[PDB]
Amino acid sequence: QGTLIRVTPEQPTHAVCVLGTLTQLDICSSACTSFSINASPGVVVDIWPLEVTLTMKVASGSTGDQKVQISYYPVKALLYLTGVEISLCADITRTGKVKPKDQRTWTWGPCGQGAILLVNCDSEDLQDMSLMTLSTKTPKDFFTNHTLVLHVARSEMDKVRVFQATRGKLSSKCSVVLGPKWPSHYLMVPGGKHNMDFYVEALAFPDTDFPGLITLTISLLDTSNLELPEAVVFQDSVVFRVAPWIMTPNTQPPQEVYACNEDFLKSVTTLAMKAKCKLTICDEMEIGYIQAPHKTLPVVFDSFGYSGLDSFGNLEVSPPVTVRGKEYPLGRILFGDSCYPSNDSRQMHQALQDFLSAQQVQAPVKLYSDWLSVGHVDEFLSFVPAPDRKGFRLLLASPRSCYKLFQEQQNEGHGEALLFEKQQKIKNILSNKTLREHNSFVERCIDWNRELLKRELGLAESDIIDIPQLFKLKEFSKAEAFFPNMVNMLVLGKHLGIPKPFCCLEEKVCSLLEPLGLQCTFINDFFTYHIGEVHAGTNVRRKPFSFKWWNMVP
Amino acid sequence: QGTLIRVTPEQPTHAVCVLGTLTQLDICSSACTSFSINASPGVVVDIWPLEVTLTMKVASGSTGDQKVQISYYPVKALLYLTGVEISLCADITRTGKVKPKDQRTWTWGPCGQGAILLVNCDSEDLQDMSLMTLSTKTPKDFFTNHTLVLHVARSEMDKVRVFQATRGKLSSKCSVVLGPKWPSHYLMVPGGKHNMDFYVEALAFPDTDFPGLITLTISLLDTSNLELPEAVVFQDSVVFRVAPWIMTPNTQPPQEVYACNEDFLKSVTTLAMKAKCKLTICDEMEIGYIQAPHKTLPVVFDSFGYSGLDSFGNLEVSPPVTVRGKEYPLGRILFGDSCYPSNDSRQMHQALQDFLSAQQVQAPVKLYSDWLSVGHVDEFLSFVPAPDRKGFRLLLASPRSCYKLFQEQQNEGHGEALLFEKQQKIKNILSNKTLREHNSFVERCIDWNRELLKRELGLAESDIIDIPQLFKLKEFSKAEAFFPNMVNMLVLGKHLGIPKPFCCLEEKVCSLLEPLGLQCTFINDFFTYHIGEVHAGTNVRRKPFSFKWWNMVP
């Protein structure tokens, strides 16, 4: 914020003083007993026997507008000063309004500052990009021996792109000033009062190689001498943070439902109309969003912009929750992995894991799901809205809850009932000593993740509801749903779309969810076998959190 | 920290309870109006109408040592428990002593916890590696249906290596359990009381791809069933932080001096004996150190373990200093770069810049040095010990301080003096209007870095001493020392080794440094031209900071 001016009695020196910067006066370097200083009314002097600082009232109308005299004894030293205004303004307040300490630090929190960029993936496009403005109030003859340059570091040049508005708020594809080939650009700025606009976009999300910060700097160069290299008289910069990709949980109000089978769509359209949300007809993707003060856009990841564990079916997120003081307003991303690494065990690709962490707003949690033949966490866990407590309920698949249901059917006298209507008897399933040992192991696997979710999400038992579900053993001792899993249901607010288990099973599940004020409608064919993968029924785009991610302190 | 035990009236269940973990008791899942519980004296129960937790007094001597009865009404439910002790202990206290919340988080600061590893670059080698111990107090027949496994994540397996002490504190190269090919390893542990030692080393320094954390986890597996996959009953882990490479400034007391010319070595040996430190005779390197509670080793980087801007001559570090509240106990690393990126400008390789930042203890500062033909920061800045103020003085090269010296020689009547004894007259140098414009530009470049160092290091003018130094212009308008630069001197405590400028110049420099209690001895040939580079004279290994880097909060 400081500049040092060294004056000398032999020759009057010229200097530029940018409004908003502390200007220091050097005296003893070229001086003698005492000194006295008299200046112009437009120059403020505050400090005499032999530190002096200068403050400008306003901008200059001509070169050498103001002056300062240094009397030492008595020989006088002259100083012709030029006060100019240079300010690179952006949305540092995050209130959607552009405003001109510290300016070189991006800070999390409500009492913090720092602008936000959106990832890109005509005025129509300009409504997405961020806006920074440059204000210059200089003498009319100032830029004959001075020049400004906007620049970004070579490491961040490919992560960002800056445009210059040619006519008003419009621009062409040739008006680029900063990009993955142009680390810097010389600005053509006229004398007098002039404000030019810049439109900035991000080219990449935060990652393990890119923390998510982009600094754009303006520099004032002195070009009064042809023989000597350019001299930096002043530098100002604004720090941009690239907005993270944020996942939305089932507790967030739905907006649009997608589906892809005959009697299936009828029950879906019924539920969508009851919850009053859009449904369009035309599983390996996740529909999140990016949020900026000016605009908020839906983003879909898969491969409205855009092993067996690398899928996004293994990607889930919890409702807002507070864990041991630490608050997670956007919830926590949940995904599956093995307990310990081995040659036969699999894990999510490290690139995908690190990407989730880069978006610090939803601190990921490694769960145990390697036991499942598919391996996705949504096979044994889910979330539903609740009127009381923390406002939600964690749904876990439970072989014990289902075995208790069957064992009482024998007690009631309904042990002759058959399912899958190859069909099998309920008495045979209960008497099946082999199946009981399998579900006992499956129960154990879920019980581990149960305590994991109770710990990392800070949950009590009064926040968990066990959904009766049976599991069998596929090849390589892997687990698999015995019947269509209820837990992987479709949540549309207070209107559920639980898969039909093929009823006594349906009767119990409702008794667990209906007291929460939930409407249970079962679907004949939620899941369909594609020949050799099982595909999910639908997909939902839900309303982004009211909580602004930048106000969070990871 | 929790495990859930589900008991049932139909069959008594067996369970393992690790000492130090909260054990929860599940009742209502297989129950009825009221319940009452009576247990063994070795089992503590705290909660009856229809949450219960169990606490173990000590470790078991046999399987099913303790028992718990659940009476519900009246049908009783039995529970055979096995209390075992499993603790993976390391130097979490950083006091050099191994001791058994939170255990999964490494925290900076004096009131923080977390172990430290050293980078590797026989008991002799064992004195460097870190030590973690595992304590197991189990029944004699415990590991017939249980097994332990030590493991590290696949992303951190190549950053770490763990050994197992075969005989006492000795080990062979075959006793490796964890490495860049072994993510996990099955531990052979006998029943009863048993403690085995592990020796751990780091394979890589903190970097942009490796933040510097390594987690080692022990897992308890239940292998009572052959048909069913292994079941994780318990997990415990310790987090290791890889110690960063730390630079030492001239203010730190020297220990050993290296040199590589006839009359040169005599003046060096004189200075080394006066400062009382070792000197061995046998410039493109930097001698830092890594620090652990148990051992501290010197590390040299170049290419006692181990463009023109990519050198380490451009690498310097400041004394301990506090900047705007923020405290930097190990100082700040200084290096050179351009003001703004261009096609003709150069910068330090991004890999090297990011590496310096990874070692967070000395937050790097980008300075302007692109103007120099060489480009190193040590050409125009240096640090010396001081009795008062912040305990040091910043030495900056100053063309103005040197021009003031010459102009007074004309005033005194000594304007006929010649240097380089092609030789040149001092009057001709002063009358040289071309040289004055060059140094005026060079002065401007240093004045920029002057305010940069006053800002980032929080320095006042009373901490800076201008050393008289002239600069000329090499090809491509680059700057170069007119005469041997004084500022790039050899600091050995309160004994300096300033280069001889070829005296009136020497007389002034001493008057600036001697009041600081510094002894000034000048050297005839400090710098030597090698045909086409200039090489530094000597190099110093200085004492590491008393301040422990792990107590710092970056």
Ligand SMILES: COc1cc(C(=O)N2CC[C@@H](O)[C@@H](N)C2)cc2nc(-c3cc4cccnc4n3CC3CC3)n(C)c12
């Ligand atoms: C592969 O195993 C599964 C995963 C998921 C799940 O929840 N998935 C799927 C994978 C990813 O998409 C996750 N994100 C979500 C649901 C499943 N339902 C069943 C199932 C079992 C069954 C038995 C008889 C009749 N019908 C039965 N069905 C349903 C019917 C298709 C056959 N199985 C075997 C499922």
Ligand SMILES: COc1cc(C(=O)N2CC[C@@H](O)[C@@H](N)C2)cc2nc(-c3cc4cccnc4n3CC3CC3)n(C)c12
């Ligand atoms: C290349 O320019 C330089 C760099 C450094 C420096 O400080 N360096 C060197 C580079 C890196 O090692 C940095 N880390 C440290 C010191 C220098 N002294 C002189 C110099 C100029 C001169 C003129 C006449 C007689 N002698 C003269 N000398 C000394 C004598 C060798 C000729 N020049 C030109 C220097």
Ligand SMILES: [Ca+2]
């Ligand atoms: Ca767009």
Ligand SMILES: [Ca+2]
């Ligand atoms: Ca999903």
Ligand SMILES: [Ca+2]
């Ligand atoms: Ca060693």
Ligand SMILES: [Ca+2]
């Ligand atoms: Ca150096």
